[PDB]
């Protein structure tokens, strides 16, 4: 086409979606990771994770307001990945990299799994 | 912080949100612009438009599944702006610029209003 494009638009949209999450505006699901609860927007979760895409495209699960993750999932790892979904920034540290990589494999977040593998390979 | 950042994340999220819109997945509102209807995600509309942000943060309106816009709004202008919200690309043409600018002023999309003003000034 003959369109013009605003370079910062996608980043500005994501920043506003994170501001809605902060303020608990139009959040429509609670993700339970053992004793912890995380509120989020189903659309953002589906856009970032192959697992959530599969969950919320299922005719029965699309209607649930609570999703319980596998008990092996670490809440801190999930929290770091949820922040990444809404900000593009990943708080990857020596003390959390194994939990983050395991959570990203479960959630099917291939780019995160890729950077974790590279950082682990560099330490070996 | 000590975060790393994935450059293409925000663009990839927006591309996936547009794929959900295409496939009518988890769309939760219909915007009516005279005889036309447009399905969308309330969160994306709020992230892009000061008018939708005000509508869906209102305690009564946040619950509506149908929003009727002012009859003076041109459906083609709205369609071009909705595509911009989901893609960052604006289909601005000599034949639609006045309708697009008027719609962006109504929807409170300041960056769009800014580029329309500049393109109009260049023609004068």
């Amino acid at each position: 086409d003959s369109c013009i494009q605003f370079t910062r638009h996608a980043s500005d949209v994501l920043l506003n979606l994170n501001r809605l999450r902060s303020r608990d505006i139009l959040t429509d699901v609670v993700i339970v990771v053992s004793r912890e609860q995380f509120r989020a927007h189903k659309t953002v979760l589906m856009a970032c994770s192959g697992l959530f895409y599969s969950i919320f495209t299922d005719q029965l699960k699309c209607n649930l307001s609570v999703i319980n993750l596998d008990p092996e999932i670490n809440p801190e790892g999930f929290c770091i990945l949820l922040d990444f979904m809404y900000t593009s920034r990943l708080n990857l540290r020596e003390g959390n990299i194994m939990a983050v990589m395991a959570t990203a494999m479960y959630l099917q977040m291939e780019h995160v799994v890729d950077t974790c593998r590279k950082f682990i390979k560099a330490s070996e | 912080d000590s975060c790393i950042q994935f450059t293409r994340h925000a663009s990839d999220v927006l591309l996936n949100l547009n794929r959900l819109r295409s496939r009518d997945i988890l769309t939760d509102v219909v915007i009516v612009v005279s005889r036309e209807q447009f399905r969308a995600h309330k969160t994306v509309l709020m992230a892009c438009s000061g008018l939708f942000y005000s509508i869906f943060t209102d305690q009564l309106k946040c619950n509506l599944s149908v929003i009727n816009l002012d009859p003076e709004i041109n459906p083609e202008g709205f369609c071009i702006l909705l595509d911009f919200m989901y893609t960052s690309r604006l289909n601005l043409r000599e034949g639609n610029i006045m309708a697009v600018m008027a719609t962006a002023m109504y929807l409170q999309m300041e960056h769009v209003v800014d580029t329309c003003r500049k393109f109009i000034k260049a023609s004068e």
Binding site: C3, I4, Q5, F6, T7 | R89, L90, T115
Partner: peptide, 4 residues
């Protein structure tokens, strides 16, 4: 704004 840019030409994409």
């Amino acid at each position: 704004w840019v030409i994409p």
